[PDB]
């Protein structure tokens, strides 16, 4: 509604303003009275599959697990590597940025001291042991799970992890009822999986879709991630040390170009008029 409730509760409300607010009040109340039934159904469905998850071994001795990376993508970092790996167990001899500096013999409990040691270094990728990778038959092993969260020590055998998992992810169900690229901070403009090519102006342009814009700080870890589509134009090259507040990439959100990576004569080949193409000329430009 365009007319706002200019009044407040200290000054009271008109009859019209009260009637308008009642719409939203009833909407919210009905949504609350309705969607938690679906939330309870979802919790029951979740707890049904995870009945048999009970820790059975301590170490299944499995191979490599899964990679771990922060959430730097999209915009600013939401959750860093500090809390995404707190309580996990590594799978390989993960090493510090200085070569041949190993802190774990393929498995250790990443309690607070190890998190501090890791964040002190410039490590950004750690491979930890996950439940999906566990090789235990008819259950999971304790080391493939990680330390318990209610206690803080390594989880002991016999504890039913599926039920607590389903309950924990079903509890908040009620509460959840409802062209250009600009750099923000100083860093290194890094292009990953880039098919680089030079435009007519001598700058750098892109000819692929599997390329991502990365912001690398002085330490080496990636801070910001951005998406660049195929056939975009970049105002800066690769490996450029620049500060934030600069529009580096420009592309038309509507026009999608077929830019040719090579240079040479362009003669019209295999376009015969009247069968596949039509003769149309611009009425203002003439080109």
């Amino acid at each position: 509604i365009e007319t706002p409730i200019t009044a407040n509760f200290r000054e009271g409300l008109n009859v019209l303003q009260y009637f308008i607010s009642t719409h939203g009040a009833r909407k919210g109340l009905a949504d609350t009275a309705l969607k938690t039934a679906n939330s309870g159904y979802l919790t029951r469905r979740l707890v049904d599959v995870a009945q048999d998850l009970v820790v059975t071994e301590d170490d299944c001795g499995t191979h490599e697990g899964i990679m771990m990376t922060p959430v730097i993508e999209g915009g600013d970092v939401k959750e860093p590597l500090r809390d995404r790996v707190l309580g996990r167990v590594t799978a390989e001899d993960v090493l510090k940025p200085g070569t041949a500096d190993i802190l774990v013999p393929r498995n250790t409990l990443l309690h607070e001291q190890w998190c501090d040691l890791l964040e002190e270094n410039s490590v950004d990728a750690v491979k930890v042991r996950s439940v999906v990778s566990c090789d235990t038959d008819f259950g999971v092993c304790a080391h493939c799970y990680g330390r318990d969260l209610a206690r803080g020590h390594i989880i002991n055998k016999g504890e039913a992890i599926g039920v607590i998992a389903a309950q924990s992810i079903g509890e908040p169900g009620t509460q959840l009822t409802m062209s250009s690229i600009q750099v923000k901070n100083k860093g290194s403009i890094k292009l990953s999986n880039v098919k680089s090519v030079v435009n007519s102006s001598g700058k750098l342009v892109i000819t692929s879709r599997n390329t991502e814009l990365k912001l690398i700080d002085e330490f080496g870890r990636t801070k910001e991630s951005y998406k660049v589509p195929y056939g975009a134009v970049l105002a800066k090259g690769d490996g450029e040390q620049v500060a934030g507040g600069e529009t580096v990439a420009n592309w038309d959100p509507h026009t999608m170009p077929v830019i040719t990576e090579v240079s040479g004569f362009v003669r019209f080949t295999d376009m015969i008029d009247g069968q596949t193409i039509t003769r149309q000329t611009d009425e203002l430009t003439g080109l």
């Binding site: 509760f9 200290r10 009271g12 409300l13 008109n14 009260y18 607010s21 009642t22 009040a25 009833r26 919210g28 109340l29």
Partner: peptide, 12 residues
Amino acid sequence: PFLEHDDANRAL
């Protein structure tokens, strides 16, 4: 009394 100073949720 003083209904106009009450939220609709709590008035209900």
